[PDB]
Write an enzyme that holds these catalytic residues in place. Sequence first.
Site, PDB file in Angstrom:
ATOM      1  N   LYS A 217       2.286  -8.882  -2.179  1.00 16.27           N
ATOM      2  CA  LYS A 217       1.591  -8.912  -3.468  1.00 16.27           C
ATOM      3  C   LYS A 217       1.263  -7.557  -4.057  1.00 16.27           C
ATOM      4  O   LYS A 217       1.060  -6.614  -3.216  1.00 16.27           O
ATOM      5  CB  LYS A 217       0.260  -9.728  -3.389  1.00 16.27           C
ATOM      6  CG  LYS A 217      -0.742  -9.016  -2.479  1.00 16.27           C
ATOM      7  CD  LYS A 217      -2.009  -9.857  -2.267  1.00 16.27           C
ATOM      8  CE  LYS A 217      -2.859  -9.947  -3.555  1.00 16.27           C
ATOM      9  NZ  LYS A 217      -3.281  -8.628  -4.000  1.00 16.27           N
TER      10      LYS A 217
ATOM     11  N   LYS B 211     -13.101  -6.271   6.615  1.00 17.80           N
ATOM     12  CA  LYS B 211     -13.842  -5.136   6.074  1.00 17.80           C
ATOM     13  C   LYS B 211     -14.787  -5.511   4.936  1.00 17.80           C
ATOM     14  O   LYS B 211     -15.684  -4.724   4.619  1.00 17.80           O
ATOM     15  CB  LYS B 211     -12.864  -4.053   5.596  1.00 17.80           C
ATOM     16  CG  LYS B 211     -12.165  -4.359   4.270  1.00 17.80           C
ATOM     17  CD  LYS B 211     -11.028  -3.380   3.984  1.00 17.80           C
ATOM     18  CE  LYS B 211     -10.322  -3.721   2.681  1.00 17.80           C
ATOM     19  NZ  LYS B 211      -9.067  -2.940   2.503  1.00 17.80           N
TER      20      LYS B 211
ATOM     21  N   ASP C   9      -1.298  -4.941  -5.648  1.00 16.15           N
ATOM     22  CA  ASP C   9      -2.734  -4.722  -5.575  1.00 16.15           C
ATOM     23  C   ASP C   9      -3.383  -5.157  -6.880  1.00 16.15           C
ATOM     24  O   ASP C   9      -2.765  -5.134  -7.950  1.00 16.15           O
ATOM     25  CB  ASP C   9      -3.052  -3.258  -5.284  1.00 16.15           C
ATOM     26  CG  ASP C   9      -3.858  -3.086  -4.010  1.00 16.15           C
ATOM     27  OD1 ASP C   9      -4.884  -3.780  -3.864  1.00 16.15           O
ATOM     28  OD2 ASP C   9      -3.456  -2.275  -3.148  1.00 16.15           O
ATOM     29  N   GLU C  10      -4.648  -5.570  -6.785  1.00 16.15           N
ATOM     30  CA  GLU C  10      -5.319  -6.107  -7.961  1.00 16.15           C
ATOM     31  C   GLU C  10      -5.330  -5.103  -9.106  1.00 16.15           C
ATOM     32  O   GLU C  10      -5.260  -5.500 -10.274  1.00 16.15           O
ATOM     33  CB  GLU C  10      -6.747  -6.538  -7.608  1.00 16.15           C
ATOM     34  CG  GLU C  10      -7.719  -5.406  -7.303  1.00 16.15           C
ATOM     35  CD  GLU C  10      -7.454  -4.741  -5.962  1.00 16.15           C
ATOM     36  OE1 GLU C  10      -7.182  -5.464  -4.982  1.00 16.15           O
ATOM     37  OE2 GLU C  10      -7.508  -3.494  -5.890  1.00 16.15           O
TER      38      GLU C  10
ATOM     39  N   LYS D  96       0.845  -1.183   0.000  1.00 20.91           N
ATOM     40  CA  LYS D  96       0.000   0.000   0.000  1.00 20.91           C
ATOM     41  C   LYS D  96       0.884   1.237   0.000  1.00 20.91           C
ATOM     42  O   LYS D  96       2.034   1.178   0.447  1.00 20.91           O
ATOM     43  CB  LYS D  96      -0.927   0.035   1.225  1.00 20.91           C
ATOM     44  CG  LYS D  96      -1.843  -1.173   1.375  1.00 20.91           C
ATOM     45  CD  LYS D  96      -2.818  -1.305   0.227  1.00 20.91           C
ATOM     46  CE  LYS D  96      -3.797  -2.439   0.476  1.00 20.91           C
ATOM     47  NZ  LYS D  96      -4.613  -2.758  -0.727  1.00 20.91           N
TER      48      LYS D  96
ATOM     49  N   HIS E 164      -6.675 -13.494  -7.890  1.00 26.02           N
ATOM     50  CA  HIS E 164      -7.479 -12.475  -7.226  1.00 26.02           C
ATOM     51  C   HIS E 164      -8.873 -12.449  -7.841  1.00 26.02           C
ATOM     52  O   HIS E 164      -9.022 -12.525  -9.065  1.00 26.02           O
ATOM     53  CB  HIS E 164      -6.800 -11.110  -7.358  1.00 26.02           C
ATOM     54  CG  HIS E 164      -7.410 -10.042  -6.508  1.00 26.02           C
ATOM     55  ND1 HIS E 164      -8.590  -9.414  -6.841  1.00 26.02           N
ATOM     56  CD2 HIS E 164      -7.001  -9.483  -5.346  1.00 26.02           C
ATOM     57  CE1 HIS E 164      -8.886  -8.520  -5.915  1.00 26.02           C
ATOM     58  NE2 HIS E 164      -7.938  -8.539  -4.998  1.00 26.02           N
TER      59      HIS E 164
HETATM   60  O1  LIG Z   1      -7.272  -4.121  -2.224  1.00 26.03           O
HETATM   61  C1  LIG Z   1      -7.516  -4.549  -1.071  1.00 26.03           C
HETATM   62  O2  LIG Z   1      -8.391  -4.095  -0.309  1.00 26.03           O
HETATM   63  C2  LIG Z   1      -6.639  -5.722  -0.592  1.00 26.03           C
HETATM   64  O3  LIG Z   1      -5.368  -5.509  -1.117  1.00 26.03           O
HETATM   65  C3  LIG Z   1      -6.660  -5.723   0.960  1.00 26.03           C
HETATM   66  O4  LIG Z   1      -5.889  -4.657   1.392  1.00 26.03           O
HETATM   67  P1  LIG Z   1      -5.705  -4.573   3.148  1.00 26.03           P
HETATM   68  O5  LIG Z   1      -4.927  -5.865   3.388  1.00 26.03           O
HETATM   69  O6  LIG Z   1      -4.967  -3.270   3.397  1.00 26.03           O
HETATM   70  O7  LIG Z   1      -7.128  -4.596   3.687  1.00 26.03           O
HETATM   71  C4  LIG Z   1      -7.218  -7.040  -1.158  1.00 26.03           C
HETATM   72  O8  LIG Z   1      -7.173  -6.970  -2.563  1.00 26.03           O
HETATM   73  C5  LIG Z   1      -8.657  -7.334  -0.649  1.00 26.03           C
HETATM   74  O9  LIG Z   1      -8.685  -7.969   0.606  1.00 26.03           O
HETATM   75  C6  LIG Z   1      -9.402  -8.227  -1.668  1.00 26.03           C
HETATM   76  O10 LIG Z   1     -10.657  -8.485  -1.139  1.00 26.03           O
HETATM   77  P2  LIG Z   1     -11.100 -10.205  -1.115  1.00 26.03           P
HETATM   78  O11 LIG Z   1      -9.872 -10.763  -0.410  1.00 26.03           O
HETATM   79  O12 LIG Z   1     -12.391 -10.260  -0.323  1.00 26.03           O
HETATM   80  O13 LIG Z   1     -11.215 -10.594  -2.579  1.00 26.03           O
HETATM   81 MG   LIG Z   2      -6.031  -5.369  -3.325  1.00 20.45          MG
END
Ligand SMILES: O=C(O)[C@@](O)(COP(=O)(O)O)[C@H](O)[C@H](O)COP(=O)(O)O
Ligand SMILES: [Mg+2]
Lengths: 99, 452, 450, 452, 450
Positions: free
Chosen positions: C182, C315, C184-185, C156, C275
């Site tokens: 990782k 969250k 971020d998506e 982040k 993801h």
């Molecule tokens: O972009 C985001 O929010 C994250 O990087 C979490 O960041 P934090 O670790 O700072 O919360 C993940 O991609 C989400 O958890 C995906 O949701 P799921 O796993 O439900 O697909």
């Molecule tokens: Mg993410």
Amino acid sequence: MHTETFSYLPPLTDEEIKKQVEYILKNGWIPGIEYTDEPGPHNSYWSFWKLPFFNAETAEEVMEELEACREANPDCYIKITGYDNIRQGQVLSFVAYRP
Amino acid sequence: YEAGVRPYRETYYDPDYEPKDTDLLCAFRITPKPGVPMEEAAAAVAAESSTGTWTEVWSNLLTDLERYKARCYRIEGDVAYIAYPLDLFEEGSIVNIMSSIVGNVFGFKAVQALRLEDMRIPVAYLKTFPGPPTGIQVERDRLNKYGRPLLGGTIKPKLGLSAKNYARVVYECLRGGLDTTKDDENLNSQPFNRWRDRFLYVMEAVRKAEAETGERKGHWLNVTAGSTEEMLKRAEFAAELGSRYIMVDFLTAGFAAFASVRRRAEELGLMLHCHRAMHAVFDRQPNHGIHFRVLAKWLRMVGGDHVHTGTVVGKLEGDRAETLGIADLLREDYVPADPGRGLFFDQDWAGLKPVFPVASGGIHVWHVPDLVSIFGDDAFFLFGGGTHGHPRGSRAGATANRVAVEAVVQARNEGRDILAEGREILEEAARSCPELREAMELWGDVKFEVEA
Amino acid sequence: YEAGVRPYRETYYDPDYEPKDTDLLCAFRITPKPGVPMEEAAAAVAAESSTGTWTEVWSNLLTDLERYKARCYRIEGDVAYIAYPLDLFEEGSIVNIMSSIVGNVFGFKAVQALRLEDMRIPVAYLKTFPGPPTGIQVERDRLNKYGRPLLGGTIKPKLGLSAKNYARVVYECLRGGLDTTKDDENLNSQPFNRWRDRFLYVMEAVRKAEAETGERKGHWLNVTAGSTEEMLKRAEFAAELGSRYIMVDFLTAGFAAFASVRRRAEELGLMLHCHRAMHAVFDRQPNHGIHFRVLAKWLRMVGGDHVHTGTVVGKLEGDRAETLGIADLLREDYVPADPGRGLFFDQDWAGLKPVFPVASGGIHVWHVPDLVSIFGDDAFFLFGGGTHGHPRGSRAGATANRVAVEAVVQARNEGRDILAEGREILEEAARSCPELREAMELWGDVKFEV
Amino acid sequence: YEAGVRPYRETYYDPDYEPKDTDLLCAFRITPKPGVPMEEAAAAVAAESSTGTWTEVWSNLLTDLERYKARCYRIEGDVAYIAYPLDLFEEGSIVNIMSSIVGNVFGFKAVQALRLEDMRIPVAYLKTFPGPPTGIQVERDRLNKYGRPLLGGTIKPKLGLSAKNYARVVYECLRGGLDTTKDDENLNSQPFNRWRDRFLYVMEAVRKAEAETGERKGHWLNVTAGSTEEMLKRAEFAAELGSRYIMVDFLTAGFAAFASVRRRAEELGLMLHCHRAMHAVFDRQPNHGIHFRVLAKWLRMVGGDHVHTGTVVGKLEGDRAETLGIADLLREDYVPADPGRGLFFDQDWAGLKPVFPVASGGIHVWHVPDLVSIFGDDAFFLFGGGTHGHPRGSRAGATANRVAVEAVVQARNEGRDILAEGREILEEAARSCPELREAMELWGDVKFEVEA
Amino acid sequence: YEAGVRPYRETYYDPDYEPKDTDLLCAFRITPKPGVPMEEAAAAVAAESSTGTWTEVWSNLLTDLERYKARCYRIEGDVAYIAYPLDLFEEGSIVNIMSSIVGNVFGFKAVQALRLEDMRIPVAYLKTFPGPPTGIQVERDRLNKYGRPLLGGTIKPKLGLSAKNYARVVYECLRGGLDTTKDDENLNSQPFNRWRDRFLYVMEAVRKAEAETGERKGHWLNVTAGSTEEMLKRAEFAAELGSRYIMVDFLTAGFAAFASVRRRAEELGLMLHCHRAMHAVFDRQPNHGIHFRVLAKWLRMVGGDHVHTGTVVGKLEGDRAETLGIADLLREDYVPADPGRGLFFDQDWAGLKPVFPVASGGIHVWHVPDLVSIFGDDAFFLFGGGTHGHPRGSRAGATANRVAVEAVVQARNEGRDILAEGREILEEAARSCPELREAMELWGDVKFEV
Ligand SMILES: O=C(O)[C@@](O)(COP(=O)(O)O)[C@H](O)[C@H](O)COP(=O)(O)O
Ligand SMILES: [Mg+2]
Ligand SMILES: O=C(O)[C@@](O)(COP(=O)(O)O)[C@H](O)[C@H](O)COP(=O)(O)O
Ligand SMILES: O=C(O)[C@@](O)(COP(=O)(O)O)[C@H](O)[C@H](O)COP(=O)(O)O
Ligand SMILES: O=C(O)[C@@](O)(COP(=O)(O)O)[C@H](O)[C@H](O)COP(=O)(O)O
Ligand SMILES: [Mg+2]
Ligand SMILES: [Mg+2]
Ligand SMILES: [Mg+2]
């Protein structure tokens, strides 16, 4: 052999042809006349009768040119075209005369 | 630094922000969790689709978040307007748009329901996309067809027909007056009908009908497959056979593989029909999902030559006002906003080629006056059941539909009111076309409910 | 022949039909248009997802529709069970499954809402798929890691970090005890951070953290891109750099390009993190779309080595009972039906390799007892904000999360009730780990509703 | 239609036209043929660089020239401002820009002299270009060098040195304190020094100097060759040897081949030094040609990591004001107009990466205070003659230049006035560096004339 | 060693040097900075275009500069003659020639203006180049056309025409008597007209006009693009369509990518039209740049089948005497020096194939007598506006231009003075050709200054 638009309706009369020419002119499009003795899927470039009538004002001027094209090429298919230079493409094309 | 959790709105709600002409804008219809203020829910969507997360991180101070963060800049009713700086997006990648804008924000506990209604694609980003490989104008020039909607139809039964029987139906449809025919979206390669067998026989039927009618024909051969490599292989074979067309289910195959097929279709000289299979999984409900007008924008950006848009009057749902907006988004150079049609932003298309709307599903001859009135000339009308369900088979059914379209176009061009005189126009043509009369008699009582 | 419109029910509803072990079965929750009975609504779904259309066609008589039609064979309340013959589907193609099962039937006027709750994939169709390219067992053997959940975390801010800064955060996380980090998506290749720059620097960080800690490391390099060719190019560069991992947003990229990358990943020796970006667009609401358990099955069939499954306590939304069923669907060889978990069918997995569940999103140290209780050892726990948001930064934050997981695992193995003693266990571990204590103090009041 | 010749101004001079944010704008300094009014000459340039020719043609009426034509919209003094619609240009192709804007209009009898001074590249068009493969920030991160101008130098004699002797000079320069060295622009592959031989030995010298100094080093291996295929082959070999850099003469090789090399440099992980050989053939004279600031824009659009910009104080021509504008155009995100520097338009760079200015040619230690004042930290200073011409050879010369730069940077950072105290700063450092003292003594009387 | 600045003249001016037949020779017209004598200005050009720099370097003593240095060996007024040893240049590379000869020496403070007037390419260096891929003789044999200038024309408007409309104009021109048509230099691939669309439709027009007239036709399809790879892709499609021709803007694309396409053109059997777009940026003014005759030599060495040479009488500038010399440089096997035509050196062409001159730009029927007199038979005359601007359009306009050329050729061959009788010959031909009469009437008053 079919000739695309309107070839599945009865052959158009002089009045019906003129009404299509009026449609072209009403919408600000350019009427034109093309003819060939070799219709068919292979022919994308029919012979021009003169140039597209950029200066045409009445459907009657166009019908007169259709008759002069017919007289000079009675053995040819002859189609009316309407052209739009904004979209840059033909907006209507149908055969008005068949040999 | 100041560690700890802060409300999203402190950083990502900024109603003083003026969107730039290069920003990407989104209109989200938000239903907050009870007790979560609208401003906080909208800030959460903005934060978690751009730069933020659930707690403050030291690494935020390594960059300039004032430059990169998305901002909710306006909340009106239950719609949040959010602006995304241009630098957040990968050039030419619809996949990247989705991964930010609809990636995670639809599953937050703070937001009970979320629906992306519209998206303002900035001109500067649009220019990174190639758009349709052919486009309406070049496609008409390839087909040598001008001045009327074009005719098509899905071969039926959807599945279960052999390749030779399949080709026979195609032959009967095309020789009867349809400009095109198509594989069903779910017909790919299966034990009862393998794709090489279908491609080979179908193209024999296409060439034969073209030679007999004198009119250029095509069949939308479905290349949809389990991998990108397999789809490209099937497109190559279609081009080797001389097909003018291939077809792809762009949502079930997915945008990344869709982009690969679009590139190869241009390289091979193929026109690309796009079926929107799976769209209603995302876009049916008004409280949650993505409206189809967003998917249609992405479709025109990647490059499809046609896409289905709904019929309004047929068997599948589609509102008239929204359908009219979608058609404009696909065909026009500039579309002004109109929330009455769900268009929350203007959309400049930056010279991208236009896309053919395709109206398909449960329609027949009696719908032609309405369809011509809704779409005008630049659209495809598809009659699958409405062709092969004719009392005398597909050839007869094909002629009925072709005649119905042409008669309505002729009447319109003469100045007649094709809605007030729709029935009478069809009855007049039926006097010179028994195929049409039998179609009108068979389905005269078949109607679906309509929504303006 | 008999032209005209007929009821879908006549051909496509058959309550006497007994499903075959080779049939593909679907459980649909249907909301008919008012006045449309469940039987005709279900028959319409069956017909328009297999062989039929809106009016009778002469070409129906060229084939035997009894062999190919889908059939609704049972209705319970608003749930309709539909059976599809094996011959209807293209071998090895999730794309074809979706094109039939969810192609057009969600947009009919006659059915105002539709949700695919579950699907029974027959063994005979499963065998046309390769499954994960690595699988839990082989992945643990490649990592040399046994007996605990594995630790991870998204870098982040999501976007806006340069390549070199990105790799600094990676380095700090990995050298502090995280097994992986990782992209971020939505981090692919952008003006502020181009993918080749990121891949190079990040792998320097990975190799450095691995040498310094003596534990094998990895970073989930996002190959997601606008075309399959570009994604494959990014996967090839990851391998050239010696990365153990790549990552793909399998829903936004799409299943066809997903299939392409999974094949390439096995050829290149890469493990494949998946993801589920976009899933909530259609798997959230109980009245419409596709339940995530169905997506999870398709994911394991194509071949992902991990996939996110939610956290329940974090969250993003997620149900505990349904999540337990999804974890079994991803990891076990056989999963019996269980109404309490929303498992409508028994699912045999025909020897396909298992997939790592991945729990991520808004979680911190206080959630570790719940997370260990829900998933057990075979899972990844990802801490993004929960790592870099530590008062002393990513290294201290990584150590706190690694310590928390290990202490809870130790307590569980000794026989303690980690839910009843969750706080106590963390406090015990915190006495020997100041980083853990500070994390506990910072986020002690940060709770999400379950 | 109306056949015949019409004055260009009737169609292509439109002082009522308001330029759009997507238009490409040009500022042409026009000298009309005596007797040809300014308006007609400017209309001729507009016409013959977009849609028009010398007589009316029937086919003009097939399209909408109001949409596509370029328009001279303002004439001020001897400068004609001309606006080009976005649709006229091929995405991502500098070659296409040139073929329209400077293709034929410089040779018309109606225009005696023509000089393209500046060009406003619209943001929407810029986004179709990839920009530098590395960029200043990523490049510094690759080199692990921060807070000072970087040192380089051209190996000399230009030609005639064997590959092993060439590598020996490189070794002495790099081990003495230069960050980089480079092939001369005209050194490619020749009988006395073939490129594989040079690449191999040079990279031995680079690795050796890097290991001995502890500082990351590079040599700008010239891949310039007679065909694109040969250039890509040489870049591949440089990458196989582990070079951080290659070099290309982007104007003599040409933009199409330059684009090919830039793509491959990114694929192979190579940083790309761009030499502007041939530029003065186009840009020297103020009455006719293309000013270098236009070529610099195109260079940043295609993607070069550095480009030469002039020294102002060295042996090659370069005005201070114009050089300052060029540096801003290469490094900044947004550059406002300033005709005092020849910048007739603002230029938004749309997030493209920045380019290192490179100051080279006839400079030595006494110029360092001026160079640091002109360029700041983000630039390369190249000492070819100024290194190997040191009384004790290249190692000693290299140390003198490195020390001179660092001492001036230190003094600046402390708050000293490096222009007023330039001499004294150098003399102070020379007290702890005999190499610098000998350089200062050797060239103290070597000066070139300067123009503000 | 002797460090310090020395005069360039000391090493790089040698008025006793006798040029070798293997030397490359340059004639530079120099405008020194005030107070800089011609000898030092010339020596600076020689030094900084070969081996030297601004101060003495210790590494000069590692080599023998007498073998490698360029040398100014003669000065006549403001013209300096410089000799370059053969070893200085990379075989087969115009790019290398320019990098040395015009690389930096045009931007020195010491020389305020510089023009390369001519260059003597030694046979020994010419033999490292392949020359045109087809050549005049083989091209005439491929076309089956002998005894007259060949007719062409640029499609107009330059930009803005769709693909299908573009091919209509092509069809009209070719069926009316033009041998060829061509893309405008700035027509590549754009939103209003993408190259694959244009290539397909245009080649339909070419094949149709060829079948209808019985004469072999061609269209010069512009492959010019942003990268070499894209240009080669467009050349491959042209060949796949059976085009006899492609076209390249060799200066805007650049010599390196030019060389790439010329190689590919020979492999694919394509003839290569070369447009000189950008040339006037630096070949127009008499005080600075590169004379077109030098560009023309480089063009023939790399290998172009045609190149534009100007019209003299049309809308773009050109000198008659200089143009006669350039035509000889492009077509002949040996061209002796001629001060009256600006030919500073004798040029042997070492058996390299000849190149078609192409006269284009603002010309109409009244110019044909002048054009035939200037170029003779071995040239293309292009009529863009002069074809589509005919009162009755492109077909009538094409016939008028073809008739005019043939009538003037016939008159010349019969012994008539086509300059003295130019109007009379056109009037005779016009009596049997109404299209020619109308063209004569429309443009009779349209003259450009010579
Ligand atoms: O972009 C985001 O929010 C994250 O990087 C979490 O960041 P934090 O670790 O700072 O919360 C993940 O991609 C989400 O958890 C995906 O949701 P799921 O796993 O439900 O697909
Ligand atoms: Mg993410
Ligand atoms: O599978 C079908 O139902 C169709 O073949 C229609 O068949 P009929 O012509 O027999 O109805 C089309 O795919 C749908 O119209 C698609 O829906 P949309 O156009 O809304 O995407
Ligand atoms: O060939 C030369 O002269 C140089 O190697 C300088 O050598 P010295 O360091 O020995 O002077 C550079 O190419 C010029 O500076 C380029 O000119 P610009 O930077 O203006 O493009
Ligand atoms: O763009 C143009 O102006 C042309 O198409 C001429 O059009 P017209 O035939 O309508 O004049 C040619 O490219 C020029 O003659 C090139 O100049 P040169 O031949 O001197 O390189
Ligand atoms: Mg279908
Ligand atoms: Mg140099
Ligand atoms: Mg031209």
